[PDB]
Design a binder for this molecule. Structure first.
Ligand SMILES: *CCC(=O)N1Cc2nc(-c3cc(-c4cccc5ocnc45)c(F)cc3F)n(-c3ccncn3)c2C1
Length: 300
């Protein structure tokens, strides 16, 4: 655990200025950090966890925050800072574009196959990194994947489930609260389904109490109209009862990277020719402005 990877922040160094959105664990705010002895206002993203915390949990919360601060990958948001008072405040780099769930919703039937398949590759790369570090996310979902730029996505909220998303969870996690790299593969399947349906709610109308019975019967999420049978098959392999039969993240990186080379062969999108392949000019602008970090080349 590198203590230098986590900055302990005092309430006097930062201020929340705008609510960006709320969820089951906390509220996301646009904040401003005013460094000690400076005059600058640096935009930051703060998430405040809504459970009443005590200083007894502090050592354990801090041990978890040290792990979240250690994750170093282009496709995973690492925790930068934390503030422990009566509430828990998690500080990271502000990402204006928000989450990939809201992004695919707001760009419904306006996203090219090239983006969708590359996002699938990037999400699998970040998950594979977490698996290599022997870490289980426990809460992979399109709301937990953030947009850095339209060409660069990063998985967020790693570690805060540990310190429930029934419809994203593998059968063994619903039944026995067992969370492994292979139950993360199941959630990856559902996350992919959320992208391919432009933010559709999985099992809409179905009460969360009925999900495990529906899964036992063999019922799964319906094939999105834009996926060929090969994209659907990879998703269905993610939702198998036997965890060991599900694909590995390393195999998912390879499969979606092969698919990204022939985008029109794997996804059927209306107006996919018109859907702008990121021009070198726009990529340079996006990168110099808000994405200077190192990142693996996007599959063309
Ligand atoms: C569709 C939902 C949505 O728009 N967003 C959900 C969300 N959460 C965060 C976010 C996450 C974290 C966080 C928590 C745990 C580990 C982790 O490692 C680094 N950051 C992590 C925060 F600390 C703050 C936070 F706001 N955001 C968000 C929005 C903008 N910029 C950054 N994060 C969103 C968006």
């Amino acid at each position: 655990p590198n203590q230098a990877l986590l900055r302990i922040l005092k309430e006097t160094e930062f201020k929340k200025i705008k609510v960006l959105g709320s969820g089951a664990f906390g509220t996301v705010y646009k904040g401003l950090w005013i460094p000690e002895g400076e005059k600058v206002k640096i935009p930051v993203a703060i998430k405040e966890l809504r459970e009443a915390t005590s200083p007894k949990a502090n050592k354990e919360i801090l041990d978890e925050a040290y792990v979240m601060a250690s994750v170093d990958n282009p496709h995973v948001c690492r925790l930068l800072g934390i503030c422990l008072t009566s509430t828990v405040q998690l500080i990271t780099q502000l990402m204006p574009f928000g989450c990939l769930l809201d992004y695919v919703r707001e760009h419904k039937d306006n996203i090219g196959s090239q983006y969708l398949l590359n996002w699938c590759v990037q999400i699998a790369k970040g998950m594979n990194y977490l698996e290599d570090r022997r870490l289980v996310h426990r809460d992979l979902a399109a709301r937990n994947v953030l947009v850095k730029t339209p060409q660069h996505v990063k998985i967020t909220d790693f570690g805060l489930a540990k310190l429930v998303p029934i419809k994203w969870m593998a059968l063994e996690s619903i039944l026995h609260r067992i969370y492994t790299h292979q139950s993360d593969v199941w959630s990856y399947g559902v996350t992919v389904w959320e992208l391919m349906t432009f933010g559709s709610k999985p099992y809409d109308g179905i009460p969360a109490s009925e999900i495990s019975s529906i899964l036992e019967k063999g019922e799964r999420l319906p094939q999105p109209p834009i996926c060929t049978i090969d994209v659907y098959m990879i998703m269905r392999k993610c939702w198998m009862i036997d965890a060991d039969s599900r694909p590995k993240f390393r195999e998912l990186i390879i499969e979606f990277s092969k698919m990204a080379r022939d985008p029109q062969r794997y996804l059927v999108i209306q107006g996919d020719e018109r859907m702008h392949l990121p021009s070198p000019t726009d990529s340079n602008f996006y990168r110099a402005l808000m994405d200077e970090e190192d990142m693996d080349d996007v599959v063309d």
